[PDB]
Amino acid sequence: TGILTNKQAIARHFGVKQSEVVYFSVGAVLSGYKVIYDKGTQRAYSLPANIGSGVTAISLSPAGVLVHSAGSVDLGALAVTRKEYVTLPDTFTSGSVIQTKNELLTHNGTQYRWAGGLPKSVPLNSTPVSAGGISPTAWVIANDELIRQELNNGLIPPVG
Amino acid sequence: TGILTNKQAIARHFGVKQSEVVYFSVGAVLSGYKVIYDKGTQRAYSLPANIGSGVTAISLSPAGVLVHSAGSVDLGALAVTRKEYVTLPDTFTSGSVIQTKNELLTHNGTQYRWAGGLPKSVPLNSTPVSAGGISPTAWVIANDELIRQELNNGLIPPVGSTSVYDVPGIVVNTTTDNRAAAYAFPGKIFIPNGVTIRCNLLPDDDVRKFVGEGKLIVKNQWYAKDHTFDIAASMNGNNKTVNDEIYCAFRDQTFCRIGIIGDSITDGAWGKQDWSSPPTNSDGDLDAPSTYNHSLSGGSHSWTEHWMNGLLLTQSRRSGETIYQSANCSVS
Ligand SMILES: [Cl-]
Ligand SMILES: [Cl-]
Numbered sequence: 001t002g003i004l005t006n007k008q009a010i011a012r013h014f015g016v017k018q019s020e021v022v023y024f025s026v027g028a029v030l031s032g033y034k035v036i037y038d039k040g041t042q043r044a045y046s047l048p049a050n051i052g053s054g055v056t057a058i059s060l061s062p063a064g065v066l067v068h069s070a071g072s073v074d075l076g077a078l079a080v081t082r083k084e085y086v087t088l089p090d091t092f093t094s095g096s097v098i099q100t101k102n103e104l105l106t107h108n109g110t111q112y113r114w115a116g117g118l119p120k121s122v123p124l125n126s127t128p129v130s131a132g133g134i135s136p137t138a139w140v141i142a143n144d145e146l147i148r149q150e151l152n153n154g155l156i157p158p159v160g
Numbered sequence: 161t162g163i164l165t166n167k168q169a170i171a172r173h174f175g176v177k178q179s180e181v182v183y184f185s186v187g188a189v190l191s192g193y194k195v196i197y198d199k200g201t202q203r204a205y206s207l208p209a210n211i212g213s214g215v216t217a218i219s220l221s222p223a224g225v226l227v228h229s230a231g232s233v234d235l236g237a238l239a240v241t242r243k244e245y246v247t248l249p250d251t252f253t254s255g256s257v258i259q260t261k262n263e264l265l266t267h268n269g270t271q272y273r274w275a276g277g278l279p280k281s282v283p284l285n286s287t288p289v290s291a292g293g294i295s296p297t298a299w300v301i302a303n304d305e306l307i308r309q310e311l312n313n314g315l316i317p318p319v320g321s322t323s324v325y326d327v328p329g330i331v332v333n334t335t336t337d338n339r340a341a342a343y344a345f346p347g348k349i350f351i352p353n354g355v356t357i358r359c360n361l362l363p364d365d366d367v368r369k370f371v372g373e374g375k376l377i378v379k380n381q382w383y384a385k386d387h388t389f390d391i392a393a394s395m396n397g398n399n400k401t402v403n404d405e406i407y408c409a410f411r412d413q414t415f416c417r418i419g420i421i422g423d424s425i426t427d428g429a430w431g432k433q434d435w436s437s438p439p440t441n442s443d444g445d446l447d448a449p450s451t452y453n454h455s456l457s458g459g460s461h462s463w464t465e466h467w468m469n470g471l472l473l474t475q476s477r478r479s480g481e482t483i484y485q486s487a488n489c490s491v492s
Contacts, residue, residue, distance in 0.1 A: 002164070002165075002168070005165045005168060005169075006168055006172070009165075009168050009169040009171075009172045009173075010172050012169075013172050013173060042171065042176070042177045042178065043175065044172065086174075086175030087174075087175070087206075087242050087243070087244065089174075089176070089194040089195075089206045089207060089208075089209060089242075090209045091209055093209075094209030094210050106241060106242060108241075109240070109241040109306070110306060111242075111243070128326075129325075129326060129327070129328060133326070133328050134326045143243070143305075143306050143307070144304055144306060144307040147304070147307055148307060151307075151316055152316075152317065152319065153319060154319040
């Protein structure tokens with residue numbers, strides 16, 4: 001079946017076992033799984049470390065917000081912490097729509113994530129500055145993200 | 161079929177829909193697709209953002225150059241912009257052949273892309289230096305590529321400043337007046353070496369707004385004229401010296417206008433009993449535009465003009481030319 005080969009494809013992408021991938025659906029038990037797959041958007045998200053035992057899925061939003069028995073988690077935000085990104089086949093110049101926190105939009109070879117409200121419309125002929133500016137609550141450069149922040153906040157120790 | 165599972169595997173790798181992957185073939189319609197697959201090389205490339213409607217595929221080269229109905233695109237170059245790389249299972253030491261701009265060859269744990277001619281032969285026991293050198297038109301380190309270039313070109317803003325390219329409203333040219341945008345922005349602004357913008361500063365504007373080593377083009381508010389503000393000199397000093405300029409002007413016989421900003425004592429009280437201040441407007445500021453010279457008027461006998469007298473009497477030992485003159489902008 002196409003399910004098994006897809007779970008297989010997903011498992012190799014994330015480096016987990018085939019048995020550790022699960023399709024989202026209503027009532028789907030989440031315990032033990034490490035990756036969830038949204039068949040509607042065809043996007044996969046790695047799951048929070050310790051989902052409780054006997055926890056079942058309720059809903060999954062277009063932004064990647066998961067609602068389940070024991071609470072709610074933003075999978076897009078979780079993917080950002082794990083640097084698990086989808087690099088959109090667009091630019092700020094070509095325009096695009098951003099749906100999740102883990103989508104990346106390119107401008108002159110540089111990738112930006114969006115940290116503000118979703119969805120984020122980006123019109124034709126735009127710029128990270130022209131389309132909401134560059135700031136912690138707006139467009140964030142994903143490439144070299146930590147080393148950039150350390151440099152911009154003087155957090156790099158002198159040699160030795 | 162093996163096609164569907166492959167498209168499936170590709171779709172998850174790039175994070176697109178299965179329907180958004182297409183195998184290359186002749187006449188294959190390209191519109192709407194986001195990834196193309198070369199079955200001969202078994203390499204996949206993400207497609208340019210807006211391929212026109214009804215566009216069909218003609219050819220796909222070993223370097224990843226795609227030819228279609230509405231033109232031609234280098235998919236390897238496009239993958240570089242998206243940092244979509246294939247890391248070859250070789251080293252410079254083991255040798256390899258490079259076919260595309262998005263292939264990476266390793267040397268001591270570091271990945272290099274090739275920006276020169278293709279294909280690129282790399283013999284056994286090589287080095288990025290030994291096999292074409294490291295340069296923008298040769299081997300390029302792919303790891304941390306942007307942050308490396310910013311560091312190697314001094315494009316990283318000092319702590320607490322923002323790069324001028326990231327500030328709302330700024331246009332980086334020499335014609336647009338960036339003054340309103342720059343001081344609407346509440347923080348400091350970093351302008352890198354070699355970069356000039358026009359910022360028609362007003363006299364009350366704190367020039368410490370700008371850091372870095374760039375330059376401002378500043379319009380004269382009273383005459384059809386521009387002035388250059390050197391931020392590097394403003395930040396680090398210009399190493400110029402009052403004595404240096406004065407002695408240099410003596411030696412070079414060049415003009416040396418000496419300006420003074422001061423109060424009552426330097427204004428000229430009481431250098432002569434009929435002393436008077438420079439003209440000032442209703443705000444209390446110096447009149448501008450102006451043809452006023454304090455040294456020929458109420459400040460004719462300020463200590464500045466006696467200072468000039470000594471300079472000119474020393475100058476007289478070389479020439480009759482009057483190279484030392486004051487601009488005494490002092491008001492009681
Ligand atoms: Cl200083
Ligand atoms: Cl007036």
